[PDB]
Write a structure and sequence with these properties.
Elements: E1 2-8, E2 26-27, E3 39-40, H1 54-59, H2 72-86, H3 97-102, H4 127-130, H5 138-148, E4 154-158, E5 162-163, H6 165-169, E6 175-178, H7 181-199, H8 214-224, E7 228-230, E8 232-234, H9 237-240, H10 243-258, H11 263-269, E9 270-275, E10 278-283, H12 293-312, E11 322-326, E12 329-334, H13 340-349, E13 354-356, E14 377-380, E15 388-391, H14 394-401, E16 403-404, H15 410-421, H16 426-436, H17 440-444, H18 450-460
Parallel strand pairs: 4-9
Antiparallel strand pairs: 1-10, 2-16, 3-5, 4-6, 7-12, 8-13, 9-10, 11-12, 14-15
The chain binds guanosine-5'-triphosphate, manganese (II) ion (2 copies) and sodium ion (2 copies).
Catalytic activity: RNA(n) + a ribonucleoside 5'-triphosphate = RNA(n+1) + diphosphate
Cofactor: Mg(2+)
Membrane topology: Peripheral membrane protein
C-alpha cells in the first residue's frame, strides 16, 4: 500500500470531516481492582502523550508496493485456491437489495452503529433513517443509490480503543476507513452469496474462519490440520498489500463466477480517502471498514501462504496444505515441517512483513501447546479431551475490563468477557468473578457461574 497524493479537501470540493477529539474511554468500576497497562489511543495531533508526529505515524502503515505483477507462483496459487472454493458450489447470483440490507441465512443485517460514510457523514443523515428492520424498505436506500451512486470516498476515522503505551507514544493509532452505505450495500449485493458461503463454511475449504464461533469451532480445527503446524503474524498486513494481490484476488473471483463484478475489488485497491480536512489517494492497501474487508483479506492470505510455499518449496503439495485465516491472522499446517523463518523471508519479496507467531523473539516450532489463533489458545477439556477449549489469556480480559465507553453497556461488556474467561478454568473464573464482585457495580451485574457455562458448553456440540 502507498499514498499517491494528499491535499486539502476544499481544493477539490470536499467538506471537512469532524472527528471527536476526545476518547470515549474512561476508567471503569474495575479500573483499580484489575491490572492493566493500556490507555486510549491518540485521537488528535495535540495529545500530550505523543513522542513523534501523529500525522506521519498514522499513515506510515503504507510501507509501499513491493511487487508489481502477478507472477507464476501467484498464478498457481490462484488456480489451486480457486479450485478448492470451486468445490463449495457457491451461488454466483447477485443478492436482492432487501437481503443485502436486512440480512438472510449466512449474512447478518447491516450494522446500525457504524458510520454511514460520505456524503451522509458531513450531510447529517444516519443509518437510523434510511433503514427500517421490520419494514425492510428498499425504497429509501434504492432512492439514495440512484441519487448518489456508488464508488464513493472513504471517510477515515482514528479508531478509539486501548493501545500499549508504546503505540500511544508513537502515535500508532489504528485508522478506520469507512465506506458509504451505498458502496457497502452494492458490494453486499454483488458478493452477498459469497459472504454467506464463507460464513456458513468456516474451515480448510474456504481457508476462512470469518463468522466462526470459537466455542464450537476450536474443536473442529485440530482435526482439519495436518501433522506439522506453522504460523506467523503480519505487521501492517492490510496496508502492505500491493495492487498485484488484489489482481490475484479478482482472478479467483473471476474463476468462480464473479468475473461479473470484480470491478469492486478495484476500488478496494485504488481508493479515495477523506481524513479530517485532507483528502488522499491510495494505491493498494485493503481499506479496514469496507463491506467484505475481512473476507477478502482471508482470501488474499490464502493466496499469499500458497505463493510463498510454491516459491520456497518447489514440488510442495498444496492439496495437503491445511490452513485457516481470519484476516491477517492464520493457523496453517503441512504433513512435513517447514521453515517459517524462510517463508517469512520470501514474504518480504512480496511486500509482506511476517514475524514469529505472537511476537516471539525468533521462529520456534509450532505446537498445539503454544499455538494461538485470534489470541486464543487450544486446550483440550480435562474431563472430555475431544472437546477443545478456545483459551483467551486473562491479561487480555483484565485489560478490557478496566475501561468503559458507555456505562449502560457494563452488563453486556462484562458478561461478554465472562464468556471468554471461563475457559481458563474454574479456579481462574471464580477469582475473576470474586474481584468483579468486590465493588458495588460488579455485585449488581448478572454474571453466569462456572458450572452453568461449562455444562451449557458441553451440550452445545
Ligand atoms: N487500521 C485498522 N486495522 C484493523 C482494524 N481492525 C482490524 N485491523 C487489523 O489490525 C492491523 C493493525 O494492527 P496493529 O496492532 O497496529 O499492527 P500489527 O502489524 O498486527 O502488530 P505489530 O507487528 O506489533 O506492528 C491491520 O493490519 C488489520 O489487519 C481497523 O479497524 N483498522
Ligand atoms: Mn499483528
Ligand atoms: Mn492478527
Ligand atoms: Na486501498
Ligand atoms: Na505486497
Amino acid at each position: 500500500g502507498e499514498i499517491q497524493w494528499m491535499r486539502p479537501s476544499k481544493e477539490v470540493g470536499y467538506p471537512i470531516i469532524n472527528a471527536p477529539s476526545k476518547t470515549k474511554l474512561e476508567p471503569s468500576a474495575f479500573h483499580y481492582v484489575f491490572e492493566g497497562v493500556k490507555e486510549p489511543a491518540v485521537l488528535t495531533k495535540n495529545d500530550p502523550r505523543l513522542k513523534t508526529d501523529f500525522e506521519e505515524a498514522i499513515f506510515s502503515k503504507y510501507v509501499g508496493n513491493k511487487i508489481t505483477e502477478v507472477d507464476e507462483y501467484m498464478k498457481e496459487a490462484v488456480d489451486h485456491y480457486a479450485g478448492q472454493l470451486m468445490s463449495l458450489d457457491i451461488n454466483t447470483e447477485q443478492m436482492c437489495l432487501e437481503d443485502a440490507m436486512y440480512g438472510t441465512d449466512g449474512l447478518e443485517a447491516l450494522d446500525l452503529s457504524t458510520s454511514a460514510g460520505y456524503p451522509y457523514v458531513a450531510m447529517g443523515k444516519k443509518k437510523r433513517d434510511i433503514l427500517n428492520k421490520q419494514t425492510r424498505d428498499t425504497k429509501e436506500m434504492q432512492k439514495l443509490l440512484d441519487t448518489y451512486g456508488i464508488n464513493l470516498p472513504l471517510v477515515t476515522y482514528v479508531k478509539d480503543e486501548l493501545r500499549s503505551k508504546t503505540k500511544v507514544e508513537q502515535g500508532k493509532s489504528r485508522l478506520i476507513e469507512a465506506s458509504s452505505l451505498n458502496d457497502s450495500v452494492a458490494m453486499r449485493m454483488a458478493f452477498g452469496n459469497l459472504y454467506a458461503a464463507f460464513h456458513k463454511n468456516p474451515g480448510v475449504i474456504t481457508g476462512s474462519a470469518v463468522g466462526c464461533d470459537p466455542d464450537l469451532f476450536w474443536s473442529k480445527i485440530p482435526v482439519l490440520m495436518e501433522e506439522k503446524l506453522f504460523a506467523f503474524d503480519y505487521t501492517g498486513y492490510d496496508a502492505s498489500l500491493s495492487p498485484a494481490w488484489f489482481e490475484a484476488l479478482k482472478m479467483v473471483l473471476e474463476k468462480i463466477g464473479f468475473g461479473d463484478r470484480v470491478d469492486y475489488i478495484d476500488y478496494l485497491n485504488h481508493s479515495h480517502h477523506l481524513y479530517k480536512n485532507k483528502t488522499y489517494c491510495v494505491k493498494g492497501g485493503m481499506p479496514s471498514g469496507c463491506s467484505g474487508t475481512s473476507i477478502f483479506n482471508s482470501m488474499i492470505n490464502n493466496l499469499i501462504i500458497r505463493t510463498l510455499l510454491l516459491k520456497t518449496y518447489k514440488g510442495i503439495d498444496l492439496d495437503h496444505l491445511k490452513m485457516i485465516a481470519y484476516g491477517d491472522d492464520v493457523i496453517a499446517s503441512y504433513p512435513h515441517e517447514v521453515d517459517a523463518s524462510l517463508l517469512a523471508q520470501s514474504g518480504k519479496d512480496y511486500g509482506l512483513t511476517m514475524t514469529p507467531a505472537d511476537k516471539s523473539a525468533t521462529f520456534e516450532t509450532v505446537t498445539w501447546e503454544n499455538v494461538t489463533f485470534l489470541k486464543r489458545f487450544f486446550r483440550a477439556d480435562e474431563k472430555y479431551p475431544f472437546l477443545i477449549h478456545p483459551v483467551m489469556p486473562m491479561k487480555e480480559i483484565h485489560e478490557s475490563i478496566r475501561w468503559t465507553k458507555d456505562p449502560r453497556n457494563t452488563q453486556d461488556h462484562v458478561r461478554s468477557l465472562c464468556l471468554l474467561a471461563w475457559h481458563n478454568g474454574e479456579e481462574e473464573y471464580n477469582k475473576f468473578l470474586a474481584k468483579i464482585r468486590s465493588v458495588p457495580i460488579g455485585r449488581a451485574l448478572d454474571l453466569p457461574e462456572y458450572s452453568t457455562l461449562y455444562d451449557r458448553w458441553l451440550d452445545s456440540f
